């Protein structure tokens, strides 16, 4: 009874709450049910400990798992739908000394991916961003922390450029999104489709745009670079604290600087900071020391403002609803390319880049705090 | 019975005075019982030879081990109590030509998990420990050999962050702490549920917090870090005698250096020394050879104070009263992150960190001796 | 499965437009088939998504792949020699969220068998080509994806050296490069005539020249090696992406390292770079660091004049007009044979040959970029 109601009730709300994840997680006497909302788990409900196993068996069914294989941890995919609700789930079940556990991660659709316009870049760098991502060929990187939008930006760009005339071709594991116009290839070690193999397949597929879900394999750093040189547009993902580091990372991973230089068109770093919920938005003031570090001066600081939430139903009482992306844009030109071929470091490139207009990740963040998206605190609190 | 009371009482003293282990050994009238309090097998008491069977039968009957079996070894788990103590032990016995031997290991209960404030950090390093482990995301490494205090540090941090409202998924083999609010997977080869398989599921299962009791499987090291890279807060336990080299060790475990860089919030190397009993502390010379080897300053020698234990009864007659943890904390800012992605060694990472003010394991320990808590020599014995 | 209707209409159009590739794109509700011409795609037709699965399934049959196997993707060459439409296709059923994408890359026809002077060899690789092919003993291996002219050149070797004084016999799958006056055999796996089996007979013929159309089978790697080992010129297509890697590749395929070195005399990799159409030969004088990092002799980096096609209504506006061959023949001597047994990296064994006069593909292609034939980017794209 309760077990069947339970699985579907949590899943239904997870989509409605836009939880990124659904948890059915057993404890000593009961099961704590939690939804990952705006990047963090919070309680939803509880199951009786007995209901737990009935519940886990039900989700194994929901994801297509082998219901009989209760010794080994398993996973699969739930095409969970309810009325207008439609988000695939990645279901994973696991034994616990407290009974079986199950979690259903929300996977996404083309309709969840923001337009390139919805990504959150400062307008200055955004127009330059669009100019870089619109290039007929060349390396464009999107790098950084969880939820940063490395994936969403990558796909916002890929969808934009996945026009009738372009083989937008990607590497995902499993496919994260359901998107038309783009060949969303899934990594499959049984087939030999490792990330490096999947990019070898990318070139064999005669592509227009590469998407490397994460450039982990050294070979993917090189293949993505080759792709750029071969006349493909290259979009690839890393985890860096800045754009100059991401270029540096292409060299740290073994990509020759003469290719990075010829191929590179721009590097983007990106991260998430909480967004103030509109239903409770209120004007507050910023910390002037941070603002002085931005170069704002007393002259502009005197009129500076930040926003926070007062709390509302939309934000779950936290004052914030969703998180927004912050962007660093290393638009690449001749001086940067001369620095790259020479083998220059992230610091050396960064100095050129800022002189050339590279609004920094931190700066775009603090800027968005100042433009009313967030607070000059959350920005600082989500980096290293 | 005398044996049952003996066992409950020795266990109480062992936990109360901080033994790592309880040693009950074969002797021809009488049985020698020692407690490894503060690392030394301090004498505790004795029993008639026939007590080897009565007392060990208690160790086994409680452990869940077969009493009659005296040829093959056994290893169990018991929640034991007397006086101020109610704490878990591992229970094991050894087949012996002279009659069995039994030793019980001082596991702590979930309810005994210390606040991070209770881990022995001086206020300075403490605030940094707190700031590191409380980072909204990333991996914290806890390192060292038998006698380092890893499980308390490991679980202390967990106590602070894995509230009942947060999803947590822990790997143990077998379970030591249990711990409502946190899902605890016990590794089970019957299934094929390795630490790696346990984490394979944890990753797909999206907990906020991941804990691994021992990073032994390569895949386990990688996954725990993978989550930590972008947003999960991860606690990992492993063997290393240097906070910066620990980074190198995680690289050795198969975790991509770039993954480590992004994930890592800090590394703590630990060691425990004997605390001097207050009621018989002896202010010492201090010894010039011991001091020379350690490098103590006249500022310390002529004003800070080192003590030895003389004997105060309350110390088991050995002059000491419990372990004093010594802590070497590497705080991972983004310069150290750079060093990591750059492939830098402990020397390079440590030198950057010391240039930033990082206190070494010997500097901390010696301070602790100089705080009048421990002995100059106890510190020396576990460092250079 | 029709599916196949489109597969056939598409293939016919792809050849007529000289598309480099066919893209049967699995989509959300349908399948979008696109052709690649001069750096961009154009749509041809669509199929129902259900037809996609039928496409994937039938193309698997076509490639000799298992139609019943869709737990994983498959790939292979399809002998679609449909009269006027007779370019061989590289089938890659790469799995996406919408099913596998049936890419079919176009592999070239005999295209007349050239003299070695018609291949565009630099004097370095040219004279060495002449030297290597003139031999009575040893394997002359050629690399790059079919369509890059491997077999074009492989058969050029025979055209030039299979004189009335020499016993020549070749085996292919299917015969791709016919040469009048030369005895050609086609494999027949149905009979059991693997390449190895044929080559085994070739050993038995005490031939002067033994051709292998594609050294792909493990048995064949061993026998093709024996083909030369036993005292015969062997000429072969080694279907990999690098001449130097081709050496190591025989070892990768299970060929005794020793037999491989005994068996080899020269390995050529070749590619074609897109041309700059004269009009837009803009002398983008090089950054010497690019050229130096490319391993271009200092003498050459100084004489170097890099180009970039402007794009340029006569290209256009890609910056390029058609393709131009570049070459790297690793003439083999004893330094190379040491390296062959060793299984050295492509770069090092190639560099050894480079100093023998083998303008590496990077030196040669770059030299051609440096003359305005092609551009930096194309060279890097083809030579990294």
Numbering used by the authors:
A (entry chain A), B (entry chain F), C (entry chain D): 505 to 888
What do the study authors state?
A third vital component of the TFP biogenesis system is the assembly ATPase (PilF in T. thermophilus). The TFP assembly ATPases are part of the extensive AAA+ superfamily which form molecular motors, using the energy from ATP hydrolysis to drive mechanical transformations. The domain structure of T2SS and TFP biogenesis ATPases is similar, in that they comprise one or more N1 or GSPII domains at the N-terminus, followed by a C-terminal (CTD) and N2 domain- which comprise the ATP binding site. Here we present a combination of X-ray crystallographic and cryoelectron microscopy single particle reconstructions of the PilF hexamer in two states which are used to build molecular models for the complete PilF hexamer and chart its structural transition on binding of ATP.
